[PDB]
Design a binder for this molecule. Structure first.
Ligand SMILES: CC(C)(COP(=O)(O)OP(=O)(O)OC[C@@H]1O[C@H](n2cnc3c(N)ncnc32)[C@@H](O)[C@@H]1OP(=O)(O)O)[C@@H](O)C(=O)NCCC(=O)NCCS
Length: 96
């Protein structure tokens, strides 16, 4: 995918209204969070947090799951995941 396709995917996620036809579940939120961090900040920072800290632990595990990818590898995955999660919910989003 093109770079502007990723920047538009990030904008579409950030422009999603509260009440709308597209609502991201928590699993999809973790997926987009992991791919975004992998394509913008590189590999995961820090060690595996306390499991009691459920959110921080969940975010670190998702980010560590993508460890070893280049930024361009994760940007296409971010676009593809957005195209898929928009199709199964009745409103397909596609770039360009
Ligand atoms: C830190 C926080 C309070 C504010 O995030 P923000 O307004 O995007 O700005 P920040 O620069 O502080 O954080 C951006 C980082 O990239 C992520 N991000 C930004 N834009 C994104 C996008 N388009 N797609 C995916 N992840 C994105 C943020 O989730 C993340 O926070 P982190 O640094 O703590 O991991 C928010 O990330 C948070 O921790 N809580 C809200 C999210 C939440 O409750 N759960 C998310 C995982 S289930």
């Amino acid at each position: 995918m093109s770079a502007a396709d990723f920047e538009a995917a990030v904008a579409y996620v950030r422009s999603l209204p509260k009440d709308g036809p597209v609502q991201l579940d928590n699993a999809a939120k973790l997926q987009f969070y992991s791919l975004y961090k992998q394509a913008t900040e590189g590999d995961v920072t820090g060690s595996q947090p306390w499991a009691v800290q459920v959110e921080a632990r969940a975010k670190w595990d998702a980010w560590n799951s993508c460890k070893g990818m280049k930024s361009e590898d994760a940007k296409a995955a971010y676009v593809q995941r957005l195209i898929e999660v928009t199709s199964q919910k009745g409103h397909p989003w596609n770039p360009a």
